[PDB]
Structure formats: C-alpha cells, structure tokens
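Students often ask why we bother predicting the structure of a whole assembly rather than each chain alone. The short answer is interfaces. A chain on its own may look different once its partners are present, and contacts between molecules only exist in the joint model. In this exercise we take four input lines together and write out one structure for the complete complex. Read the inputs first and try to guess which parts will touch.
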Amino acid sequence: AKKVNSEFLTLTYGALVTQMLRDFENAEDVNKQLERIGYNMGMRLIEDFLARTSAPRCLEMRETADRIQQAFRIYLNIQPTISNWSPASDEFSLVFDSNPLTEFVELPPDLTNLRYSAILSGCIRGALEMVQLEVQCWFVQDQLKGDNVTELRVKFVRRLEEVIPAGED
Amino acid sequence: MIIYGVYIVSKSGGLIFNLDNNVPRIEHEKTFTYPLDLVLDYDSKKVSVSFNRKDGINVGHVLVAVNGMPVNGVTLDDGRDVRTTLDAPENYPINLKFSRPKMTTNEKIFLASMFYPLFAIASQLSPEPKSSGIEILEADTFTLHCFQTLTGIKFIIISETGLNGIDLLLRKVYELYSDYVLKNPFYSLEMPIRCELFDNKLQELLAQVEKTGISNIDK
Amino acid sequence: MTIFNLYIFDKFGTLLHYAEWNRTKKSGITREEEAKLTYGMLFSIKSFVSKISPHDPKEGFLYYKTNRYALHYLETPSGLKFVLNTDTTAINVKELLQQLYAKVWVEFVVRDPLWTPGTVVTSELFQSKLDEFVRQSPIFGIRNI
Amino acid sequence: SQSIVALLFSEIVQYSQSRVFTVPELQTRLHDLGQDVGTRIIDLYFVRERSSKRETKLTQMLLFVKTTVWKNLFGKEAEKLEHANDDERTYYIIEKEPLVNTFISVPKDKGSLNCANFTAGIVEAVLTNCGFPCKVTAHWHKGTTYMVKFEDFVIARDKQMEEK
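Now the answer. The structure tokens for the assembled complex follow.
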C-alpha cells in the first residue's frame, strides 16, 4: 500500500534540512553532510534494490543507467529518463520528473549554494560505490533552482572489479 | 531439515552474526574400567580421543565431566589431573561423559576468519573463465550456501544435505538484513550484529522452516 | 562425462599429475603455484567442513559448485587427492572419479615399476589411458552431489 | 515505499546522535523533529479527513487524531485511547505497533527512548496546535504507549465545557 505519503516524507526531509541549517549557518557543511547521508543511504538502499532484480553488476553503463532509473520508480515512484550520451558514450543525463521531497518546498535565495535533493545525487553515489563502480555524479539542471524538470549528469570514472566478483578492494 | 548455523561476514570477513539454530550436540556416556581402550591422548587442554572410536564417539568428542565433575583445562575441578584418575583403578568403574567440543563464539569467529579468503580466493585462476567464488559447498553431513550480494555481504547458511531451495532462504535473510540495517548507521557496516529484533524474526523464520513449504515468501 | 581438467596430488602435497581436456581460461601464473594454491584450497576446505559440521564427517568434504563451473574432490584413505573440474550437467561424478581412480590411476601408475611414489608421474601411456577413459562416456557436465 | 523512509528517518536519528552527547536530549531532539513535522501534519489532515471540522471535545478531537494520523502515517490506527479517572489531565494512547520498530531498532541498553519519542512529539504538536497544549511522553508500558498530560488550564476549560 506504499505505506507512506509523499507529503509525509517531504515533511520529514524538509524538517531535517531546516535542522541542519539551524545547526550550521554555512550551506557548505549542510551540502557535505547531506551528501554524506546520501552515500550512507545509497549503500544500504542497493541492498534492497538488488533484493528484487538480480541484475549483473555492469555489462555496460546503459545497464547501470536503467538500473538507477528503475530504482526511483521502485522507491519514489517516478520514472526518470536517460539521454544525452557522449561520443565517448560512458556518461549520460538523467531526468527526474517530480520529486516527492520537493513538492512545494521553496528554498531561500539567501541559501542558493545549497543543493537540496543532492541526497539522491549522493544515493546513487553510495549505490554506485557498492557495486564497485564509483561515479562523479551531480546535477546540470535543477527543477529546484528554477529549471523546468530535474536533470542530473552522470560521469562514470573507473571500475573496481576483475574477472572475479571479488574484484580489487 | 533445520538451518544449523546462519552466519554472515563482512568484506574483511569477520563473522558478523553467529545466528545459531537450536543444535543439540550429541552427548555420550559410558562407565569405563581399568586403563582404557580409548585413546586418552592429551592434546593442548583437550583430553580427547583420536583413535579407537566406539559407541558413536568421534575424534572431537572430549570428556566434559566425570561423574558430574566438569574439567578445567586438563585437571579435575577438584584439582586432580585426568590421568591422575586414569592411573587410579580403585574408583573404577567410573563414568566418563564425552561431548564433541562445542564451537564457542570466538572459535566460530576464528573459523570464519580463516575461511573467508578461501571463498575470496576460490580458484581465482579457475579453469572456466569469468567465474565466481564458491557459491555452494556440499559436505558429508551439511551443505553451506554462500551468497555474495555482488559486493560486500556474504550470507552463509549451513543446512541439511538433502535440503532444497536454500537460495530462497538466502533471499529472505537478505530481506531481513535490510529490514534491520534500516535503523543504525552508527551500527557500522562491519560491526557484529547485536540486536534482538533480528533474533526474534529469525526465530520466526526457523519456526517456519520447520515446515518445508516456503510460500508468500514464508517468514 | 567430458570435463575441464583433473589434478592429482600426493598426501604430502606435491603435484603428482595434472591433466587437461577442456580448460578454456589459460592462467597467467604458473600451474605449479596454481597446483599449490589448489592444494591449500582443498586442505583448508577439509578443515572448514570438518569443524563447522554439526555431525561426524565420515569422508568430509565432497565438492563445490560455482556460478559457471564446478569442482569435485576425492580423498583416498591413502591420503591421495583427486580433483576434477567441469561444467554443470551430468550424473553425479563421485563414482565417476572413483572408477577413474581404480580403473586407470591404480592400473597405470602404481603397477608401473618406473613409477616411484614421492615423484611426479610422467608417462605417455598413463596420459593415453586417462584420456580415453574420460572419453569413455564423454558427454559433459557434473552437477556432483 | 518503506525502506527509504525508515532508513532516512534513521539517519535523522543518528545524525542527532552525532550532534548529541547523551540519551535524554537526544530524545529531546527526536521530540523537536516530531513537533516540526506535526506542526503541519495537523492542518493537512484537518481538511482531507476531518472535512475541515473542529472538535472542541477533547475526546472527539483526540479520537479522530488517533484514527487519522495513524491511518495515513503508519496505516493502522492506534489500538486504544483511554482516559485515566484519577488524573483527568493525564490520559493514554496505546499503540501496540511500534513505529520505531517498524524499522527494527537499536538495543535499548545504551539508550532508553526512540522514534517513539518522535511520534510522541508529533502528537504533542497536534495537541498544542489544536488548542489543547499537552505533554506527550513515549512509554514502554504495555508496549508502546503515549502518556498525555493536559495543562490544568486546558483540562479546566474542558471541565467547564463538560458542565452542560
């Protein structure tokens, strides 16, 4: 029954963001720790995303893109769209349509340096850590910032696994 | 039928969670006579038998308590040596009480520590290419199922030889692992599991797996 | 049952003999260090199964199976070790490896005056006998139990 | 989903544990966050469930909150709402389902209180904004219960209204 309301989680997250900003005036630290907790969630979250689909780690990067894409539909019940691949064809752009945590939560223009929902941008980080595929991942257009629809840019950097599943570590 | 020892190990391999099912280790009793057919060979505080196995006695089987006197190391609780009573024939016949040395917690920790690189280095240059480490081991009296979550976590549960569909049990313990690690980020990703919630829900799982039927996946 | 490869190690732990028919991935390390790594593999496996078993290990370890291949083991009461390796689908190969041991290795190693225990076994006759004996019922696979 | 909320809330709790050096005012942080969420939970759930209708009767408003907040937050309305006759300021709302243990929780050896306090703070904010300021304490009595302590002023206004 989805056992949650988008509003409910939105309230919890907004209150938490309020809490950090009340803790540290500088948005730099709130961004740091929010990406830290995004990493933290993304490590355990993949343990459930792989509890349903037993996809092989990475045959190709488009497989990773579709995996992370379906992840949000599993959790946040939104379908992102993958596009804008390089001639190198390793990176990509990913579109989040509607963000439950965002829904009518305005941000102070005196707080612009904050990356509000970057937890997801870090969750995939924490996710991509686990499968031994670290990634330079972040946003190029933010529906939060005033852009039309959310758009995160994924630059994969390097692998951590050999012909054995154990891989380098 | 039961899942003997449900365990799990970190990337380093320290046994995270020694979930022991109820496992009655066999206890043997016998009233012996003048110096023994049994090989009462002393080996590092383990007064056991290597040769001359009788009456369902194994190599591990070690004296626990003659006439209900538990052994401390090699000596009697009253302070006499095992062989001190062995040379003495007046008390004979005397009741010896043998049990296989029950793996304590630190023992199982060392066992998992010594095991881990085995699976980790499991024929790294195996004849077949692109292969994995050991996925299933099958032994004389048990079968170990190890399941790597493609990185990090290794669910290692040992079940009966003839048991089937253990992979689904691994799936459910994967689920309950997630349901636990929900709560404590201060629970480090390599700290041992100490939580009674996981304990009781896995006791429910054991009660279920008393029944073979796993459906709506049974927990 | 056609298989990937077979290993024969003395109780001391040296490479008595190796045989290959299907081993596809050709390693980079030397097959000598590979043989020693397999022997440590096997002995530590034997310790593991001996100690974590809740009940008496009569013959101890049996085999392991992986995602893509599988490995089977044979402990002689002499302490000799046989190990075979292949893909998945066949009759259980415990009696297969026993038949190979009794019918070939006993026949064409021990019975040879040239064969001196504590050394390697180098003979084209035994290589033949082993080859055609695996080629006796040589379809494929293991699924050993 | 459930894993996302359960985890993410867990990081609220433990990050507070980071900024907090002891049990009790850690629990106070949990209470404060429960307040900061209930402070809008209240008037959201007002319109969509109470049909935008105010309940001056402490019993009726409290019962309706008991149904609504639990029905939408955690699905199952709390089992029982009781009023203690010895102390009309102090009533109980027992919820056998632990909302902390929905995400099965920490050993309560190093600590005592949990997300129970967070939902207690939610209840307290709902009460104090409904015009019934109160103290809501999570208690491991008969499992999870929330003891509610009404201000003598508020319960006095109630008693005067309970003079028909």
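Check your guess against this: Residues 1-145 of chain C form one domain.
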